Amino acid sequence: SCYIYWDKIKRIASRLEGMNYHFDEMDTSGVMPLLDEIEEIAHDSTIDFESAKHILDDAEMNHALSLIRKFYVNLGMKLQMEKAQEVIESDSPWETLRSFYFYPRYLELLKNEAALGRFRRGERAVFIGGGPLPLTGILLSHVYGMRVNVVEIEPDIAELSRKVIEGLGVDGVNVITGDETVIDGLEFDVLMVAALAEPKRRVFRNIHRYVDTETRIIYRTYTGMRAILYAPVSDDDITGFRRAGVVLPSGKVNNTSVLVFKCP
């Protein structure tokens, strides 16, 4: 085979590689064009899922794919870091938060997930992998009226996220510093696994130990050409669970959301 996307992807990866050579520290404003070139490929609706695997998972794409995925992770993290601090400093913190590049996507994504998980006001939710900008946790309370624990493994990132929540005046959102294993000590009706929470295999094995067969578990993944952004959760990762629902994204939304329940 002979996909025209292969050359386009390799050239983007070459640009990323040259950039990384010069700077470890991401220039978030400067790389927005690169992100948009990548998302135009990711959002190409003409490409079916099987074809996406044929193009993205080809052996000769491995190196380029790894560069693009690392870029997406590092950019997303830096954008979150920068926005968190902006929110904390702002006299108009909600207006500041809504300016986050990806903000409207979260509204659409969470709508999807709330239907999939049958979210109800007052239910307890745990979100594993809050990051510096705990937007999903914030929305689960602010929009869905859930009582939320957000879990974050890096103590300084956890601290930042707490200041963001305090800055916005959002109630019902607590941040727990620790790994996924903290769920042993929490009551919850629904558990969500962040798109970038890693390592997947470990996270799901630990989840399996601590949840029961009634716990609604939603995880975020990448399918079709959106897999250019990040490695999907594999079926091996979710051994001991059964899939019970999936929402495929459209528009600009990147994540696929999967509902699973612990067997048996």
The residue behind tokens 């459209």 is 250
- Which H/E stretch holds residue 83? helix 62-89
Distances 154 to 117, 172, 219 between C-alpha atoms, Å: 28, 21, 20
- Give the residue from 153, 244, 242, 164 showing the smallest Cα distance to 196: 153
Cβ at position 3, least distance to its own copies in Å? 6
Residue 23 interface partner, choices ligand 3O3, Br ion, its own copies, none, CB cut-off 5-8 Å depending on type: Br ion
- The answer to whether 180 is a known ligand-binding residue is yes
Cα–Cα distance measured from residue 173 to residue 175, given in angstroms and rounded to the nearest whole number: 7
Residues 6+ apart with CB under 8 A from 165: 134, 137, 138, 173, 175
> Given candidates 105, 124, 163, 202, which one binds ligand 3O3 under the rule CB under 6 A?
105
Q: Does 225 bind ligand 3O3 (CB under 6 A)?
A: no
Q: Which residues bind Br ion (CB under 5 A)?
A: 3-4, 15, 23, 70, 92, 94-95, 135-136
Binding partner of residue 50 among its own copies, ligand 3O3, Br ion, none, CB under 5 to 8 Å per kind? its own copies
Tokens of 34: 């690169």
Q: Which does 178 bind (CB under 5 to 8 A by kind): its own copies, ligand 3O3, Br ion, none?
A: none
Cα–Cα distances (Å) from 67 to 19, 35, 63, 192, in that order, read: 11, 12, 7, 27
Closest CA to 215 of 129, 118, 135: 118
- 6 makes contact with ligand 3O3 (CB under 6 A): no
Q: Is the distance from CB of 248 to CB of 227 less than 8 angstroms?
A: no
- The CA distance from 231 to 61, in Å, is 13
**C-alpha closest to that of 134 among 113, 158, 156:** 158
Which of the stretches 48-56, 81-89, 103-111, 147-155 binds ligand 3O3 when contact is defined by CB under 6 A?
Answer: 103-111
Q: Is 129 near ligand 3O3 (CB under 6 A)? A: yes
Report the candidate in 218, 173, 175, 188 with the shortest Cα–Cα distance to residue 125.
188
**Is 78 an interacting residue with respect to ligand 3O3 (CB under 6 A)?**
no
- Partner from Br ion, ligand 3O3, its own copies, none contacting 117, C-beta within 5 to 8 A by type: none
User: For tokens 């295999």, what's the residue?
Assistant: 201
Among 151, 194, 228, 258, binds ligand 3O3 (CB under 6 A): 194
Contacts to its own copies by CB under 8 A:
1-3, 46, 48-51, 53-54, 223, 235, 238-243, 245-246, 248, 263-264
Distance of CA 36 to the CA centre of its chain: 18
Instruction: Return the one option of its own copies, ligand 3O3, Br ion, none that residue 92 interacts with (CB less than 5 to 8 A, by type).
Output: Br ion
Has 152 been labeled as part of a binding site?
yes
Is 220 a binding residue for ligand 3O3 by CB under 6 A? The answer is: yes
3 state SS of 111: helix
At its nearest, how many Å lie between its own copies and the CB of residue 50? 6
Nearest distance, CB of residue 219 and its own copies, angstroms: 12
Return residues touching ligand 3O3 (CB under 6 A): 76, 102, 105-106, 109, 129, 131, 136, 194-196, 220, 253-255
Binding-site members for L-glutamate are 106, 136
